[PDB]
């Protein structure tokens with residue numbers, strides 16, 4: 312279905328946005344441990 | 348529109364998947380510079 | 384608002400093709416894909432579960448199994464609080480190599496990291512090469528918990544992660560008190 | 561297959577609220593949002609353009625402007641090959657602070673990093689506080705290229721990034737020959 316396809320794509324985006332947020336925090340922290 | 352909403356969500360996923368791929372490579376490289 | 388009370392870093396290791404990504408895909412999104420896409424170095428998924436009324440954020444790192452990625456994946460062991468060691472019950476070689484993956488953990492991870500062995504693809508009964516008894520005995524030899532799993536049929540995937548997370552939380556709570 | 565021939569790391573810096581995220585949102589996805597969501601530390605977007613028949617991958621880091629995020633954002637300057645310095649033509653304070661952002665670049669980025677000043681929100685004519693002439697003169701004082709932009713009306717956003725990328729590529733090509 313197209314709405315089931317729509318909701319599954321909406322849920323995908325949310326999950327990818329959540330992973331991106333965590334990875335960005337991880338990048339910022341690793342860069343700070345390096346500048347030491 | 349729902350199909351314009353569907354295509355825009357499909358394109359979002361592709362872009363987020365591409366950013367995630369790059370961030371994962373960046374994390375792996377920073378961790379390797381740290382283990383030095 | 385902050386969406387979790389604990390944050391546990393988990394790692395999946397084991398030979399290429401044993402089902403690490405499929406196991407995680409079942410756990411994090413309740414889905415299975417038969418088409419093999421070997422992991423390029425590392426992949427990453429999040430899921431937040433509840434234990435003892437508390438929100439447990441699981442940051443799960445899915446390593447590539449091929450030796451070519453050893454340098455990249457080894458650098459993820461350091462922070463891990465729980466590690467799934469995965470083999471394929473239809474692939475005796477992947478089971479034999481679990482001993483070498485344990486040595487890799489002991490060389491690169493924390494001494495007190497929580498560990499668990501998964502014999503995956505237990506739905507493929509017709510091609511089993513490693514009995515469940517042998518998997519239990521290997522785990523027993525190392526003092527490590529053991530479970531057979533199926534990402535495809537959704538068997539023990541929930542149990543595996545919840546059990547490993549419960550063991551990390553129990554240890555952490557004892558360190559507080 | 562590898563999808564690019566050059567990879568340029570770009571940074572956007574400037575006071576909070578000047579439109580760094582909106583400028584990038586216009587460039588990377590051709591969209592504008594009026595609702596302010598201040599950036600938490602750092603954000604990240606990719607776009608691959610073509611120059612001289614070559615594929616140029618732009619990894620663009622959108623820093624937070626608030627001083628509370630100084631420690632986090634400063635650590636991104638080191639690798640940058642091009643930096644957009646953004647102020648708000650309706651906010652004279654954000655323009656005054658461009659001199660301090662230049663000093664921040666000179667303390668933390670490469671000496672030869674490519675730089676560009678953007679006077680953003682040029683569509684808000686009725687609230688302009690900094691003339692275009694003053695923006696040109698500040699840029700001239702520093703030997704830095706200058707453009708007024710509008711993320712909302714899509715003015716000079718393409719021009720800004722393509723120009724900065726062209727300057728990086730020109731320098732890199734001269735270093736090869």
Ligand SMILES: Nc1nc2c(ncn2[C@@H]2O[C@H](COP(=O)(O)OP(=O)(O)OP(=O)(O)O)[C@@H](O)[C@H]2O)c(=O)[nH]1
Pocket residue numbers: 397398399400401402403404405406416417418419420421422423446447448449503504505506507532533534535536
């Ligand atoms: N029948 C069955 N097939 C499975 C199961 N788990 C994984 N597979 C199949 O096994 C293949 C390998 O799965 P992956 O999860 O990609 O393997 P991997 O361990 O991540 O391999 P690398 O990324 O190269 O380290 C895939 O084609 C899956 O379809 C399972 O539980 N049952």
Ligand SMILES: Nc1nc2c(ncn2[C@@H]2O[C@H](COP(=O)(O)OP(=O)(O)OP(=O)(O)O)[C@@H](O)[C@H]2O)c(=O)[nH]1
Pocket residue numbers: 574575576577578579580581582583593594595596597598599600623624625626680681682683684709710711712713
């Ligand atoms: N009219 C108009 N408004 C704009 C323009 N660019 C940004 N804005 C508005 O200005 C506000 C701030 O924009 P942002 O891009 O989020 O600001 P920022 O520089 O990223 O701020 P920080 O993330 O806190 O550093 C938003 O509400 C936008 O709607 C523009 O070109 N024209």
Ligand SMILES: [Mg+2]
Pocket residue numbers: 403404405420421422445446447
């Ligand atoms: Mg995999």
Ligand SMILES: [Mg+2]
Pocket residue numbers: 580581582597598599622623624
């Ligand atoms: Mg912003």
